[PDB]
Write a structure and sequence with these properties.
Two copies of one chain form a homodimer.
Chain A: H1 4-30, H2 32-37, H3 44-51, H4 55-67, E1 72-74, E2 79-81, H5 84-87, H6 100-110, H7 113-122, H8 132-154, H9 161-167, E3 170-174, H10 180-188, E4 193-198, H11 201-214, E5 219-223, E6 235-241, H12 250-260, E7 261-272, H13 278-281, H14 287-303, H15 316-325, E8 330-334, E9 342-348
Parallel strand pairs in A: 3-4, 3-6, 4-5, 6-7
Antiparallel strand pairs in A: 1-2, 7-9, 8-9
Helix pairs in contact in A: 1-6, 3-4, 8-10
The structure holds sinefungin (2 copies).
GO molecular function (chain A): methyltransferase activity
Subunit structure (chain A): Homodimer. Co-immunoprecipitates with DarG in the presence and absence of darT.
Family (chain A): Belongs to the class I-like SAM-binding methyltransferase superfamily.
């Protein structure tokens, strides 16, 4: 059993780690981690000169980074270094493997703590519009992942899908945001016809503009509320990348996806890998982060519209049964070894007319 | 590490760092959940319940069940709350409730957990200062200052009268007989209230640069009938006090001054010959290498960067920061004219050194 002293030490260490996460976030947004990755052991003043930043701020940052045992400090020379084995997963050189990106979510969630606490008392939720910086960062992260992996890694999970897209299909991306997924697919698959759907006017406008700029005649964008969608047998392929669990009306959205698919069509839904049973998530890395992100964003945004409030950790078992309730009788869950965060749900609609 | 060379310590691998950093992200989330549990009274509620459902916990706390459920999820994966899948019941083990609830007094670690969101709220402002210099003004931190008073208040209620004041040989006797006492950088006036209640024969003045702290203290005095407690608004860097006080106390105010050396000079001047300064400030070394590995060090450098240092730099100040340290504190006491200085420590407050500085008679 854990003692009072052991727990006290463990929680104090958690306090220090929360602080360290904020320092890493600052080091990412300032460019200090990138700067340090390109330098030999250097003084605070040297690092600040190289970074283009105020030395007094750099100095205090380095101090916490050193007590956190990320940055290494030699008292003899007053020099600091970022060892290469840490630098690799904390810098922009790593693209979407840059773990420092995730650290930014600590402040983003902290910014809404007081609003979220109020909802414990008064109900409702914090509206979607309160989180613009959070949404911008999420779109940037998904963008980088799509650039790295959508065409060559993700779509080939679905047996026969690349050939289907090469031959030419009608494809829709539901909750398309920026339109990065639509743009990449429209470039890779000239014979296919792609529609991004989103309820954000700004998203739709942006996608349309980006298509026009690239001369992508096969990429179009439409504003719809996915819960009110009207489309019957329009698409061979529907993709949904993290756009179900935040929904006000997830069951209706899923039913509308089923209805929008042609007989013989396929849904690729990408969403968060977790169990619907709490006990299974204990001890899995990032579980606490996922429940916290849920409480403070994904769940509360849905509850702000009197929605379902399924949350980020809605989990595989519930996702699978909700796909069944939507009409899908053929559902497979794929995983990629290097992706611990997402499940890839492949739901096929029967060919019967 | 090839396996071919003896090394003084474990060389951490890319993988192992990955796992450590991910666990830090989880720990940050857990801190936020504990902060939320403190502010909602959920930790307190659970501490006087047997194992219970999400619905039962919500009912007992008077809160929305859907929020409590998601909270309980994260508290369980963070291994604070325990979940029994057989009965769908949650419980807060007593050994943990003993340091996460108001009833634990000065051992309630849920209080410091509130810092994460508070520093999170200013992160973007602080990042701007890395590029543009200056700092984030003190007025950007209204809630963070309530945290500060909650934290200091735990130590004051537990230790001020019976442990702290007795650290100065003969001070309690002097106070019982009657002395003139000032608390510089007083805040809400918790310490002044406790002293004036304990020592009816002594006169106590709280001084702070906030008019509503001053009027808070002043109201609370008339409301409690403490005629021997008063409060005055001044900036500590510009005072006309000369031989006004037998005793001056300063609790965690020196290191965030714009002009700390000037403030210490003013304290020296304000003391009568043979008087005493009790300066309580953060326990740490002025040498970075000494702080590596000490619990709460990263927390201290982080709060410094994002509050204590930046508020001083906002005023074109010294920016000594939270971790200014024992060596610099002692030399700055020397510079200000204090030739007799001892550093004490107490069990009820791991975060602070108690500097006792005497002015020659
Ligand atoms: N009810 C809705 N109807 C249409 N779009 C919605 C609805 N609810 C949320 N959204 C959009 O769904 C997207 C949710 C995003 N998290 C997914 C964005 C995108 N697929 C990505 O991977 O970056 C946002 O662009 C929202 O504007
Ligand atoms: N230059 C100044 N003049 C007057 N007060 C100041 C000055 N600089 C900082 N402060 C005050 O210093 C106090 C610093 C607090 N950390 C301590 C409050 C209180 N002594 C406590 O232990 O809770 C705040 O109440 C500020 O209002």
């Amino acid at each position: 059993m854990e003692t009072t002293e052991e727990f006290g030490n463990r929680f104090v260490a958690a306090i220090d780690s929360a602080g360290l996460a904020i320092l890493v976030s600052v080091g990412h947004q300032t460019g200090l981690l990138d700067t340090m990755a390109g330098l030999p052991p250097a003084t605070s003043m040297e690092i600040a000169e190289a970074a283009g930043l105020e030395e007094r701020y750099v100095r205090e940052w380095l101090g916490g980074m050193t007590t956190g045992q990320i940055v290494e400090y030699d008292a003899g020379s007053s020099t600091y270094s970022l060892p290469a084995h840490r630098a690799g997963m904390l810098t922009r050189a790593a693209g979407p493997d840059n773990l420092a990106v995730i650290a930014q979510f600590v402040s983003l969630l902290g910014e809404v703590e007081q609003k979220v606490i109020r909802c414990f008392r008064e109900g409702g939720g914090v509206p979607y519009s309160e989180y613009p910086r959070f949404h911008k960062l999420m779109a940037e992260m998904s963008g980088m992942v799509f650039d790295a992996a959508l065409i060559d890694v993700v779509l080939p999970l679905v047996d026969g899908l690349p050939d289907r897209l090469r031959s030419g299909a009608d494809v829709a991306d539901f909750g398309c945001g920026s339109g990065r997924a639509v743009k990449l697919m429209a470039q890779a698959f000239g014979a296919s016809r792609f529609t991004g759907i989103d309820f954000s006017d700004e998203a739709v406008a942006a996608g349309t503009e980006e298509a026009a700029r690239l001369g992508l005649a096969n990429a179009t964008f439409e504003r719809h509320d996915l819960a009110e969608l009207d489309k019957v047998g329009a698409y061979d392929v529907i993709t949904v990348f993290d756009a179900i669990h935040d929904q006000a009306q997830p069951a209706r959205v899923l039913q509308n996806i089923y209805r929008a698919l042609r007989p013989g069509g396929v849904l690729l839904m990408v969403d968060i890998k977790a169990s619907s049973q709490l006990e299974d998530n204990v001890g899995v890395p990032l579980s606490t982060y996922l429940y916290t992100t849920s409480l403070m964003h994904c769940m509360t945004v849905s509850l702000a519209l009197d929605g379902a409030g399924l949350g980020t950790v809605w989990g595989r078992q519930l996702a699978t049964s909700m796909l069944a309730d939507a009409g899908f009788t053929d559902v497979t869950v794929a995983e990629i070894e290097s992706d611990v965060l997402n499940n890839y749900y492949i739901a096929r609609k029967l060919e019967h007319h």
